[PDB]
Structure 1
Amino acid sequence: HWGYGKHNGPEHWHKDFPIAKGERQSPVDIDTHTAKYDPSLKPLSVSYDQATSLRILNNGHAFNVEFDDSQDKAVLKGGPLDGTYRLIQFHFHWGSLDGQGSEHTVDKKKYAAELHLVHWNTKYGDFGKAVQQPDGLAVLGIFLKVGSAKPGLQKVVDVLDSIKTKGKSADFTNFDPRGLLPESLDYWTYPGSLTTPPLLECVTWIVLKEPISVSSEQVLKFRKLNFNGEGEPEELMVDNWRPAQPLKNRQIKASFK
């Protein structure tokens, strides 16, 4: 099916997912000079104090940390959002080298990886309804650069050896996603899509200005994962990122001068 290699990668996706060539696809390059300060943005609220993590899983494309989204235990509101968005999962995209891996870019600069905290609009009842709406999803994106270790990421790193191959999952309760956030909540925002098939144009993207730092050992553990399942030819899970897409009729708004 779809992947990131020469023969099933981003360049091929449009054949099964024609929205791949749509009007509001993600990720994009963030041109800091032409994004516009928007004073009408409300202050962003990331309320993760009751977040209830469940599980960590390797799905053959990335690894997901899934959350109990049956109540408003961990929500995003404010900023460009009108309504309450519930955290359902987070995951990363990363590269084979420290100079690539992020999906969004900033003035064409690529980061070593990118964290995506996925939320869905509670006004639509469940995630599946949300992915049928133009404002059903909000994804908070955070850049990763290589440097000092991120303490809050280490638990994730520790468990990766139990989900090496596609289809493996392990219990992952009591993880606090706040440990993954940079100091500043300054952000750029724009309307776009899922960066993976089915590439649905559902997403209010909120990309933080400040990257977090991770150690080379942490990202290296990322790179030791497998795209394949046990017993299949080993293919290291690296460079699982879609390149920047045309902005088309979209303006990036910024929360900061």
Structure 2
Amino acid sequence: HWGYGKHNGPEHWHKDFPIAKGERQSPVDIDTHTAKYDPSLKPLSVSYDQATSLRILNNGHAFNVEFDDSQDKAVLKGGPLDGTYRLIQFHFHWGSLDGQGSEHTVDKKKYAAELHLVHWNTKYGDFGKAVQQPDGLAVLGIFLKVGSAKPGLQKVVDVLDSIKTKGKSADFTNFDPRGLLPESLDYWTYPGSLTTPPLLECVTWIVLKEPISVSSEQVLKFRKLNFNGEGEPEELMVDNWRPAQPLKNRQIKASFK
């Protein structure tokens, strides 16, 4: 099956998922000089005060913190979006070394990790239908650099021992995702895709300019997770990122001058 190894990694995905060579694939390099300020972009509206986290799962490619998305509780609106997008899960991508790990890059710079807060357009009724639509998802991407610890991430870090291997899950209630945001909501935006199979071209990408700082110990703990299931040779969950894909016929717009 697909993964991030030499024999099943990103260069192989097109054989089972031909859209991997499509016209709006993600991630991309964000060339900050070529991104144009769009004064018609509105501020992002992040309404997470009623978020209800439920569970954390190691799915064999990352860990997902999952939310109750059966009502409008944690929603993203505004920015480039029309309508209301409900938070369903967040996860990260990260490297084996602090110098790599992000999916998006900024002037070819790689951050140590990248957080994806995944939301689906409520006009499509549930997540499975949304991913079949060109405006079905809005993913908020936030870069992680290594420096000072992020206090709001520590609850995530400390449960990872309990989901070391693929298929393990743990209760994860009462987690506040606002503790993962940077101060500024300035962003870049462009039309793209899921960055893992099935690579569907259903995502409005909203990538924040301001990274968050996490400590070396925090990302160290991400790197102790396993891609494999319990009882099967240990493969550390590192470098679970897809590299930048061709921009093709797309413009990245900036919300800020």
TM-score category, normalised to shorter length: over 0.9
Q: What TM-score results when the alignment is normalised by the length of structure 2?
A: 1.00
Cα distance in structure 2, aligned partners of 1:126 and 1:59: 20
Cα distance in structure 1, aligned partners of 2:92 and 2:210: 16
What is aligned with 2:47? 47
* Structure 1 range deviating more: 34-43 or 137-146: 34-43
* Structure 1 range deviating more: 39-48 or 11-20: 39-48
Cα distance in structure 1, aligned partners of 2:234 and 2:43: 45
After TM superposition, give the deviation of residue 31 of structure 1 in Å: 0.1
Cα distance in structure 1, aligned partners of 2:61 and 2:43: 33
What is aligned with 1:65? 65
Cα distance in structure 1, aligned partners of 2:126 and 2:62: 23
After TM superposition, give the deviation of residue 46 of structure 1 in Å: 0.3
Across the two proteins, how many residue pairs are aligned to each other? 257
Cα distance in structure 1, aligned partners of 2:60 and 2:118: 18
After TM superposition, give the deviation of residue 42 of structure 1 in Å: 1.4
Cα distance in structure 1, aligned partners of 2:107 and 2:132: 32
Cα distance in structure 2, aligned partners of 1:111 and 1:42: 27
Q: Secondary structure at the match of 2:15?
A: coil
Cα distance in structure 1, aligned partners of 2:112 and 2:124: 34
Cα distance in structure 2, aligned partners of 1:137 and 1:240: 21
Alpha-carbon RMSD across the aligned residues, in angstroms, is: 0.3
Q: Is 1:187 aligned with 2:187?
A: yes
Identity %: 100
Q: Secondary structure at the match of 1:83?
A: coil
Cα distance in structure 2, aligned partners of 1:214 and 1:182: 11
Q: Secondary structure at the match of 2:65?
A: strand
Cα distance in structure 2, aligned partners of 1:95 and 1:176: 25
Cα distance in structure 1, aligned partners of 2:2 and 2:44: 35
After TM superposition, give the deviation of residue 5 of structure 1 in Å: 0.3
Q: Deviations over 1:48-98 (max 9, x none)?
A: 000000000000000000000000100000000000000000000000000
Q: Deviations over 1:219-255 (max 9, x none)?
A: 0000000000000000000000000000000000000
Cα distance in structure 1, aligned partners of 2:239 and 2:203: 22
What is aligned with 1:217? 217
After TM superposition, give the deviation of residue 7 of structure 1 in Å: 0.2
What is aligned with 1:143? 143
Cα distance in structure 1, aligned partners of 2:213 and 2:40: 31
Unpaired stretches in structure 2, ≥5 consecutive residues: none
Runs of 4 or more, structure 1, over 4 Å off, are none
Q: Deviations over 1:139-171 (max 9, x none)?
A: 000000000000000000010000000000000
Cα distance in structure 2, aligned partners of 1:139 and 1:196: 13
After TM superposition, give the deviation of residue 202 of structure 1 in Å: 0.2
Q: What TM-score results when the alignment is normalised by the length of structure 1?
A: 1.00
After TM superposition, give the deviation of residue 43 of structure 1 in Å: 1.4
Cα distance in structure 2, aligned partners of 1:255 and 1:43: 8
Q: Secondary structure at the match of 1:173?
A: coil
